Amino acid sequence: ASITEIKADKTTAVANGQDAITYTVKVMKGDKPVSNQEVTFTTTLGKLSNSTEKTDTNGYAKVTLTSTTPGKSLVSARVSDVAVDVKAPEVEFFTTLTIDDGNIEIVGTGVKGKLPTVWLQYGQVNLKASGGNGKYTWRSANPAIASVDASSGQVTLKEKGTTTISVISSDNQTATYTIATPNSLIVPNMSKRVTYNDAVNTCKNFGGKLPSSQNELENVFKAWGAANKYEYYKSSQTIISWVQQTAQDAKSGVASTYDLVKQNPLNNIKASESNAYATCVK
Numbered sequence: 001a002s003i004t005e006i007k008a009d010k011t012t013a014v015a016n017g018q019d020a021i022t023y024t025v026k027v028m029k030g031d032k033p034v035s036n037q038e039v040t041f042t043t044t045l046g047k048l049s050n051s052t053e054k055t056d057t058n059g060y061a062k063v064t065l066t067s068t069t070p071g072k073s074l075v076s077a078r079v080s081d082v083a084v085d086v087k088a089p090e091v092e093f094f095t096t097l098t099i100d101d102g103n104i105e106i107v108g109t110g111v112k113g114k115l116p117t118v119w120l121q122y123g124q125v126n127l128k129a130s131g132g133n134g135k136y137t138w139r140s141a142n143p144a145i146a147s148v149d150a151s152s153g154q155v156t157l158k159e160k161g162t163t164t165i166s167v168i169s170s171d172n173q174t175a176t177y178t179i180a181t182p183n184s185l186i187v188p189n190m191s192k193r194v195t196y197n198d199a200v201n202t203c204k205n206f207g208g209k210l211p212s213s214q215n216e217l218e219n220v221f222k223a224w225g226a227a228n229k230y231e232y233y234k235s236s237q238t239i240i241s242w243v244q245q246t247a248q249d250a251k252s253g254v255a256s257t258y259d260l261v262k263q264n265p266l267n268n269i270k271a272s273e274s275n276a277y278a279t280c281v282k
Contacts, residue, residue: 001029003039003077006088012133012171013067015093017047020064023088025077026055033059038080045073046093052080067093095131097173099165103128107154108229116223119157119182120260122232123224127153127177132169139166146179156231160185160282185282186220188227188239188260196255196271199242199278208282211243214265216281217258227260238262241279245271 005026013019023041027034037055041048046067053061065075070093076085103112107124115125127148129136138148140155142163148155155165157179166176189202203210211217227233239260249255249271256267257276269275 001034001079002027003079003086004028006077006086008075008089008091011089011091013065013091013093014173015067015070015095017066017068019093020049020066021073021091022062022064023075023077024060024062025086025088027059027061027079033057035059037061039077040080041075041077042085043073043075045069045071048075065091069093070095092133092171094133094169094171094173097132097167097169097175098130099167099175099177100128100130101177106224108227109225111225115179117180117182118184118186118220118223119160120186120220120224120227120230121188122156122158122230123227124154124156124230127155127165127167129153129167129169129175131175132173133171135170136167137170139168140164141166155179157182186217186260186279187282188233188241188277188279190233190236190239190277193240193274193276194278195274196242196245196276198274199276202278203280206280206282208280209244211241211258211279211281213243214256214258217241217243217260217279218263218265221258221260221263226262233261236261239279240264240266240276242269242276 009022027037035057039061040052046065049064055061075088078085105112105126138153140148145161145163146157162181164178168174240257243256245255254268255271
């Protein structure tokens with residue numbers, strides 16, 4: 001005789017044409033349920049499992065809704081032989097939450113691509129998510145390896161290892177990106193310039209080695225750009241760093257350097273003086 005209940009098990013769903021919202025109506029005649037009553041449903045958006053359904057011996061009728069496009073959806077039901085629709089609670093479908101992992105942005109240069117496999121320690125990249133209701137919250141499974149700003153999606157690489165960065169949207173979805181273990185980690189020691197020999201020892205104590213050449217650090221700049229574009233090194237106007245001596249450099253007491261801020265590869269720098277910073281490669 002009349003629909004006295006019209007519920008939806010959830011008010012949000014993914015527009016993948018599979019995530020379904022189930023609507024349940026109850027037909028009653030006073031304190032008595034109406035069994036085998038035909039109910040017809042209609043929607044303003046999406047696909048209904050069936051346009052018509054018959055109630056149970058308990059007066060209940062059920063149907064599901066899915067959608068391939070995002071947007072608000074309004075389902076209505078009516079007692080078959082009567083032309084008076086009853087509106088159900090409004091629901092919303094949202095695009096699949098995704099992390100644009102092929103366009104990870106290098107914060108210092110704006111270059112977009114895959115995550116570099118050579119990491120300037122504390123280098124930063126921006127991860128972009130899309131889909132869901134647009135309200136994102138980020139997290140890292142292991143902040144020791146890499147941390148992420150919960151609101152911006154900006155990641156800071158810290159130590160060699162593999163972890164995952166996840167983003168969740170408030171419509172209740174989750175997307176994740178896995179950070180692969182890097183081949184090398186670059187660690188500039190900015191507290192003081194040191195002699196070449198002191199740089200050698202510092203790298204050894206850090207369990208690493210001096211850059212093998214200007215080429216090794218040039219590739220670092222190639223991937224990250226000027227180091228002082230990153231929060232951690234913003235106070236440095238120069239990160240001139242020692243590179244391993246060639247046989248000839250050793251013989252003459254000099255070494256070459258490469259500057260992670262200014263590039264500027266130099267040679268014939270007196271090694272016994274504190275002419276550069278110790279940058280370790282781990």
